[PDB]
Design a binder for this molecule. Structure first.
Ligand code: HEM
Ligand code: HEM
Lengths: 145, 145
């Protein structure tokens, strides 16, 4: 299932993922917070899963939110690093899904992260071509949920 | 407290962490699996916390074990990347501790990783000076548990 989704990660898709990550991943705190705060702004209902973070309206200034935002970027770093080995990509993706499954986050719910990613990419001038590539990586994770 | 523990990361300690991570972090899969397999070998009592992983003695061949091993290395990468800013290091450590606190992992239990780290460093010709530097970073996490 996850292997089949990983199959959509073609040579060109992986190339665009790596090229865009070279920029997005160069500021994990800034872009990580941008992703998270954008998710909450565009889909307020997702805040229901983050009661532990406290006052999320504080954004970057909220230590817990900042800690979470920086940390999510290392999961993405992990994924990008394993792109050339399907066997490793699949095992770290299934490992990553464990806690999200326990939190009862469905594939559909997880997919809401696509909008924020598209917006963050656009802020760095990466068009639809790149957004589509990232949607395919997100789809690999969705296959594990 | 974690804030006092973070202040123990002096200039030279941070430098030694970076110099050793440059090598250790070069092969996250290899060193990650080595680190975890060594933990189970020197402290069989910790295996109980990893029932989900299955037969841990299979090592690299165990997909779940390999997935976990690679993933733990990105947490260390996160810590090293935050050494420049104490405020960020602290919020990232507290974030990291959440799930370990839920699993009932004590500071004493977590500290068992020092042995494996010392042995992996030694395998790459990094002596006691580096093992002690890493023990200080581990102490920051211990203060949060
Ligand atoms: C590209 C997207 C995402 C990445 C890379 C990501 C990454 C992570 C990472 C690494 C953690 C810490 C480890 C863990 O507890 O599993 C985490 C925690 C969590 N994630 Fe995900 N996640 C993403 C999207 C989502 C979405 C869309 C939701 C919910 C709608 C979600 C909800 C959570 C929650 C509630 C936690 C715990 C937060 C806390 O209490 O600190 N994640 N995620
Ligand atoms: C260098 C030290 C360590 C690092 C960097 C590390 C890193 C991580 C990371 C990143 C995760 C995945 C996210 C999460 O679920 O929290 C995790 C999971 C876990 N950790 Fe830690 N950890 C370390 C040591 C330990 C130790 C010493 C124990 C137990 C004695 C422990 C027990 C666990 C368990 C049981 C899981 C879940 C495994 C699974 O079911 O996949 N960790 N750890």
């Amino acid at each position: 299932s996850v292997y089949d989704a990983a199959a959509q990660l073609t040579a060109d898709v992986k190339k665009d993922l790596r090229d865009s990550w070279k920029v997005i991943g160069s500021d994990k705190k800034g872009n990580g917070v941008a992703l998270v705060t954008t998710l909450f702004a565009d889909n307020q209902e997702t805040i229901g899963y983050f009661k532990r973070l406290g006052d999320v309206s504080q954004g970057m200034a909220n230590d817990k939110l900042r800690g979470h935002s920086i940390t999510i970027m290392y999961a993405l770093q992990n994924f990008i690093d394993q792109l050339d080995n399907p066997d490793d990509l699949v095992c770290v993706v299934e490992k990553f899904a464990v806690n999200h499954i326990t939190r009862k986050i469905s594939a559909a719910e997880f997919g809401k992260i696509n909008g924020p990613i598209k917006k963050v990419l656009a802020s760095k001038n990466f068009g639809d071509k790149y957004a589509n590539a990232w949607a395919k990586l997100v789809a690999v994770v969705q296959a594990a949920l």
